[PDB]
Symmetry: C3
């Protein structure tokens, strides 16, 4: 669609800046469990994607995604309500543009949640697995979101992903969980992206687990790559919405409903957690 180059991203950023006076410091990509956080944003300005020229379009059953501006724990945020998952067939530019817009809008930290299957056998339903690293299967293939001409305006041709999941933010998130009595739910792990949209087969899960993957999802990494590429610090957490089935004999099967259910059930806690992290961001 529209190339996530500086010209287009500026155009979109400027259109947004006309619509809100909130200069976001924190971008929040609303994933599993963050539905309430998005909702609890203070003094919020809600801008439907449909109202932002050249902003990529996505919907939940026809309802446009929204950019939500306002504050959260006294910090200025922009919340993306409505993501651009690659299994939907969105282009690299589509996925990248909103993140690069965040960059120009002033976002310094991106916080993202997602739903993931627990590969690591110690994980429990409802666990939070803070991403400390990832395995970008599509990226290792030739489906890295950065494939194509590099937009030098945003980042370097060969971005390193050394400390992609900012260790300081991870430490803070863990501390906030600990201080608030749910440190036991919080783990740190390697998230592997399956392009999807099929859930992983038991053989695939077994393989991924053996690759050193703790959780598996179909999202997030592309956004993270774009965020890191343009120098936005990233905090990302997977909500373990289901325990990956490694056994082909099992009759138990992953399903989006239980994924949604776990997200819905953990939303209040995840909101509290994110709000309390935001409150303590440097």
């Amino acid at each position: 669609s529209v190339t996530a180059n500086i010209e287009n991203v500026k155009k979109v950023a400027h259109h947004i800046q006309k619509l809100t006076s909130i200069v976001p410091e924190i971008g929040i990509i609303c994933g599993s469990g963050l539905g309430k956080l998005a909702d609890g944003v203070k003094d919020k300005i809600t801008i439907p994607y449909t109202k932002i020229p050249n902003f990529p379009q996505t919907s939940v059953v026809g309802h446009s995604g929204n950019l939500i501006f306002g504050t959260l724990s006294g910090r200025k945020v922009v919340v993306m309500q409505g993501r651009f998952h690659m299994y939907e067939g969105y282009s690299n530019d589509t996925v990248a543009l909103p993140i690069r817009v965040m960059k120009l809008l002033g976002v310094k930290i991106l916080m993202v949640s997602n739903a993931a299957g627990g590969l690591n056998r110690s994980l429990k339903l409802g666990d939070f697995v803070i991403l400390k690293d990832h395995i970008y299967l599509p990226g290792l293939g030739l489906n890295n979101i950065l494939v194509g001409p590099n937009q030098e305006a945003f980042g370097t041709r060969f971005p390193a992903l050394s400390n992609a999941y900012d260790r300081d933010l991870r430490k803070l998130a863990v501390q906030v969980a600990e201080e608030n009595g749910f440190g036991n739910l919080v783990h740190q792990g390697v998230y592997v992206m399956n392009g999807g949209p099929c859930y992983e087969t038991p053989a695939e899960c077994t393989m991924l687990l053996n690759m050193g993957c703790d959780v598996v999802g179909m999202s997030t990494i592309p956004e993270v790559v774009i965020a890191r590429h343009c120098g936005i610090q990233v905090f990302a957490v997977s909500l373990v919405t289901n325990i990956s089935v490694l056994d082909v004999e099992s009759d138990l099967k992953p399903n989006h409903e239980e994924v949604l259910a776990t997200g819905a059930q953990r939303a209040e806690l995840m909101q509290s957690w994110f709000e309390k992290i935001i409150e303590k961001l440097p």
Copy 2:
């Protein structure tokens, strides 16, 4: 290619339904070892893909063969669409979704695969009990794109993708028919291809828990499972994968075809005998 949506798929199915009075309950995708299967089909009509508007075209044209096999109404796909050929997701998906509309409840598919598992012998049958969809994991899943809701859910689970009941039946059929010793169950990994796997790739795949490696089938399986078609899939081990970079052994497509053809009669009989035994 034309989108494998319900409107287009309906149109194709409807055109086909005007060409045959046979409501197939079993879809068969002929892969390695399934050459002489079309012959065994009775009350059969052969519909060249060329005769079906908006049906994908592949090679002589591919044929949609309807008729009765072992007392059961079948549609047999003669000519498949392999992703390494550059076919689109929609192209590969449409025939399976057409099968769905035509009434197919079970998809039976054979393919040729390299034997990674070191206990496999040339000419063995490896019933797929699971798969590793390397292209799918890497963002080339056949279902990438808007989900066609008339067919299935956005995020299909693949848990019993290779129907355990069909697998059990296939194994029982092989055993009672004296070739149980040829039959394994294993994990099929898809290499997009069209290169055979390097020794290093094979070693990696074997260590990933893969028993056989092929360049086909998974995309159809995914589409079949997405739209609720039960799947039975078997790989004929047409060659033993070479894991050793120092080895002079190597896959050869002619030998692969030869091995497949050699097993064709047995594979046919097996499929026929499985179909005969399917619950009615």
Copy 3:
């Protein structure tokens, strides 16, 4: 861009053949040599109709042999198509290339590797290829090769043996390893988790290039010699403060790598 079929490749080859009399026997792709080939004819890509543009084809003699040096690669992470990446290699085939020598930069996965080490590729793991981004995906160009190429001895064992002997006799055999190159489509460097996974996949070095060219080369019957310069040691622990294209390691080893290539070419069998 233009389909890397026999017609288009012929057009380009024929064109190049008007611009030079040099029939190359060896094709060379330097990643991390061309600056020093005798009686060199420097052909800018821009001067070659239908030829991909990013860039020079440098024809001439190297260590007594006619070579074509490809200066300027087409990397998949750049968004170049399969046909674009393949065409230069198929052009080489048409030009007379029988041996392709390629060097590249790679991260050292194998823990025994040191910065500046040479890892001769003896095999590869084509992650994009396994995942449906194989350069050969699409109609097979039958004039060049078969539909399903085997990749047996893809990294010609005799050439590897020779390269090792040359390194040995020239007193830098200590630097030379052989191993498996895995391609990450890129352009991101691999995360520690990814490196760990790749290492455990049996990968010794990781880069973002080369395999597609090698695949095309093998597809059309060109012998391949490929070496990775270990330009950095892959970080496997996400807890480290250590990947950067600022490297540099290539500059350090440039003259050595170049001398090695020259000396290999010197010893190559000649029909």
